[PDB]
Design a protein around this nucleic acid. Structure first.
Lengths: 82, 98, 84, 104, 92, 97, 82, 109, 95
DNA sequence: GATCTGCTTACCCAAGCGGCATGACCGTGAACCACCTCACCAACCCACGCGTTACTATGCCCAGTCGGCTCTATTCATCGAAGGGATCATGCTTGCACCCTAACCAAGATCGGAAGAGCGTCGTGTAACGT
DNA sequence: ACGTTACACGACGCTCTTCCGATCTTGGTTAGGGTGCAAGCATGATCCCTTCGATGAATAGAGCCGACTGGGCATAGTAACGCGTGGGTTGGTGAGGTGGTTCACGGTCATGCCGCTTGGGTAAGCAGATC
């Protein structure tokens, strides 16, 4: 129900910090969150984007990488180094 | 029943939407509306996401200011309900429809 | 490979107009202002998008950037902070 | 040694001088115009940021967001007049309900 | 590699409020405000220099433009700050 | 016994007469003295070239006429004919002043 | 010295200004409001013109200064220079 | 420099001075350089606008049985045309008066 | 002795071309001069802004045409754009 | 309650006409600034490469939207009333034209120094790669 | 946590060329008050209609549920756009005569138009009727 929302909020708040320059692979963040949640039910991949959009206002969804190998990336966040 | 008396849920919604800074118009229908409107000027012209976002923010701010002026006109007219003539007067005084 | 859009201005739903009015400070809304608020929004968007498309066309570009919309709004005496 | 510190400022006066000379405002630009412009810009920025911080501390927050900037701007008569036509993106509106519509 | 006013706005914010941070949307709005006010004052100074058949923009033109644009006590305080900065600049 | 016009006829005659003419409606000397008095608060012993006063008068009359047009539009909107101070206040507020 | 000249804007001037504006009936308390509005507008325009004429090292308010002051507020005036 | 000195307003068929407009554009603090075809275009636009407003003013002056265009005629020609009124909405014309418009509610029954 | 320029020589020529038998008063000529100056200032300022936005250091006919389209409303913009294009074509076609 | 008249009081206009009064034009002239001349680089234009993107089309699902019932709070539509305003009459108070305008200030050249522009060198940040 | 294709960016030192603090007239402008004169303005009656407070009646907008469905996210494909980089064509000035332009002015005249009657045409209120 809403327990997953609170857990995702907390994980994003103390694991991701807003930074206007750096860009992160979009799949890596969700995989790390799922690995964290596999220690006690993880949020759906279509709702994790909504949660991270609510938490960070100024975040973009770029599609980086070379031709053919373009993968999605969050732009505006990085790891909190903790 | 416990039905709320009319006129208080309106004030609750006013206090909710005045202290909140999200976007009121849904993003996708507004983007489609912008694309349709620009379909008449030049065809095969794409829109950046930031351009649509800026258009939405500006349009929402403009409509909110216009509705503030309309509410002022309605209150001046000894009313509480805003009406199409109120919007027309508000746009006429500001210098938008001669 | 494209689509044509028609009957779209009524995609600005009545609850959206109600929420805009609530943020404005309106307590009671007459049922006839939705068809007028939609027209007002349409004409304002038409003007702003016409100016933005002119700015883009002069730049020999085929996509409307955010700076084009910012300059189009600035031309009509409506500055916009937040998009450069 | 840097010119922005010889005037005891935080804003850059070299960048302001370059923007004033390359912006095609006049044939020549005096050596005292970038300093004055940088000082005015820094003062205005400091005033708005101080008001924004005061408005953000009221909400028990620690980060200034566009809502706090709009609250600071609209709650000061001089700043509201200066930024009168300006629209702040995702800044909302200042809460003001007309006294007629309140119940009694 | 685009020049901006992020570092200096952050320095000013730390000077006034050493504890409160600033978001990225708020930083963008501050950058836009700085650019717009700079453009306003520079344009007013250019018009002032053109009206009097002058060619240079000195501190006097900027001061009069500040008097014209900024209202009320803001103009007085900005003029005082600009004069203080100018007199500190010429004195080495 | 004397020919007494009913209230409104002379007002309409004045409306039709003063829109057909372009002359200055405020007296020149009182307006010049008022301008001098206002300007003495910004600079003592400040001379006025005798064309800036005329430009000020033209601009002020045009502003007042536009404001009264807006005031009449607001007064008619409230199912009224007489223009009241609240009409002027509402017009000036909606204009953005 | 001059004092209390706003009363020089007489009632038969504010009226006939409303008449040019197209007003049929006029309230009794609107003359003072019009005098106040005229005073504030004149104060703004004259202050701008005085700054314009002070930057020019002059002591007479030229009509060009008034025209520029009006243009600064968006009320461009035709007939005295441009 | 052996030529007949054909003025630039004669090549383009205009009446407004191309050379004076070019000089103003150069010493107007607009850009470092001004293309040769820009003064011609600007002078043509200015001449067209002047011709249109003067035609409307002359039309509004013949109705009043007058030979001399006065400011009132310019105001009448500007406030009537929709495009001109939109272009010069904020502009005040000295001694122009106002358009004779009376609301339908003030009129008697 | 304080030689000041004006458009009163050219406005009269344009008026005589349109209305061959209609003079213009010296007070309306001042208004027409101010109108010409104001429209020139608007168009030149918009052209300079357009040149600066695209990092161009030259005002071509493209900048003036775009400024005209931005400023002049609707039909006026189309007519003035056609006039300017015709004048430029005639100018470059006749050296 | 509104259909016609018994007519008696306030605004344009083609005259005649005077009389200014403003505009067109003729030379003056005289700065004065647009114009036509070889060169010469910065400014602009154009071709090619990829990274990235706007617009397409699935997949999920619940929170927002659409629509019908009920009801009452809000907006009209009348009635009186009386009290603001409109209109007209007298008596001026003061604005409106011309001047003895004397002081005063806005301009057109003067003394040099003060100062800014334009080139030559020199101090501080980084588009990614290992322990 | 540490260095680089050394480029962006700014600052320092040095010619070269413009540009201002003080005067010096110079005369054009404006405000040192003064005379008359009539024409808007002040003030006061008077009565007129409009606006403003009840007061029922309509009515439609606001809650409130019940279905229901699409926006708001994440994925990819693809034709295309846009920036970066490298070569390859063009306007202001090194300016310098050179002469048509246009700007001021004295003046003369043509006529445009702002005011005195003359008499018309329009609106507009003050009095006559009854279920």
């Amino acid at each position: 129900s809403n327990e997953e929302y609170m857990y995702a909020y907390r994980w994003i708040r103390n694991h991701l910090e807003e930074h206007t320059d750096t860009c992160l692979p979009k799949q890596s963040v969700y995989d790390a969150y799922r690995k964290y949640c596999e220690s006690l039910r993880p949020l759906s991949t279509a709702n994790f984007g909504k949660i991270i959009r609510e938490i960070f206002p100024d975040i973009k969804a770029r599609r980086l990488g070379g031709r053919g190998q373009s993968k999605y990336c969050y732009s505006g966040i990085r790891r909190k180094t903790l | 029943p416990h039905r709320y008396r009319p006129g208080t849920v309106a004030l609750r919604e006013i206090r909710r939407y005045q202290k909140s800074t999200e976007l009121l118009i849904r993003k996708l229908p507004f983007q489609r509306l912008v694309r349709e409107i620009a379909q008449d000027f030049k065809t095969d012209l794409r829109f950046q996401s930031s351009a649509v976002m800026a258009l939405q923010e500006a349009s929402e701010a403009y409509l909110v200011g216009l509705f503030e002026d309309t509410n002022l006109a309605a209150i001046h007219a000894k009313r509480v309900t805003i009406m199409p003539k109120d919007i027309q007067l508000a746009r006429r005084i500001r210098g938008e429809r001669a | 490979h494209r689509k044509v859009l028609r009957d779209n201005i009524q995609g600005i739903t009545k609850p959206a107009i109600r929420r805009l009015a609530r943020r404005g400070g309106v307590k009671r809304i007459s049922g006839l202002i939705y068809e007028e608020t939609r027209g007002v929004l349409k004409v304002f968007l038409e003007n702003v998008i016409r100016d933005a498309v002119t700015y883009t066309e002069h730049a020999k570009r085929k996509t409307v950037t955010a700076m084009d919309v910012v300059y189009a709004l600035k031309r009509q005496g409506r500055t916009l902070y937040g998009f450069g | 040694k840097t010119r922005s510190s010889r005037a005891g400022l935080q804003f850059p006066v070299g960048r302001v001088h370059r923007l004033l000379r390359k912006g095609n405002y006049s044939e020549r630009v005096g050596a005292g115009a970038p300093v004055y412009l940088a000082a005015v810009l820094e003062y205005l920025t400091a005033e708005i940021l101080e008001l924004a911080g005061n408005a953000a501390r009221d909400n028990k927050k620690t980060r200034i967001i566009p809502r706090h900037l709009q609250l600071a701007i609209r709650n000061d008569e001089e700043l509201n007049k200066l930024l009168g036509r300006v629209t702040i993106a995702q800044g909302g509106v200042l809460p003001n309900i007309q006294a007629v519509l309140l119940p009694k | 590699r685009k020049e901006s006013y992020s570092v200096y706005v952050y320095k000013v914010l730390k000077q006034v409020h050493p504890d409160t941070g600033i978001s990225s949307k708020a930083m963008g709005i501050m950058n836009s405000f700085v650019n717009d006010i700079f453009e306003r004052i520079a344009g007013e100074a250019s018009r002032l220099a053109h009206y009097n058949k002058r060619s240079t923009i000195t501190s006097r033109e900027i001061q009069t433009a500040v008097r014209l644009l900024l209202p009320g006590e803001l103009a007085k305080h900005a003029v005082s700050e600009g004069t203080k900065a100018v007199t500190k600049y010429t004195s080495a």
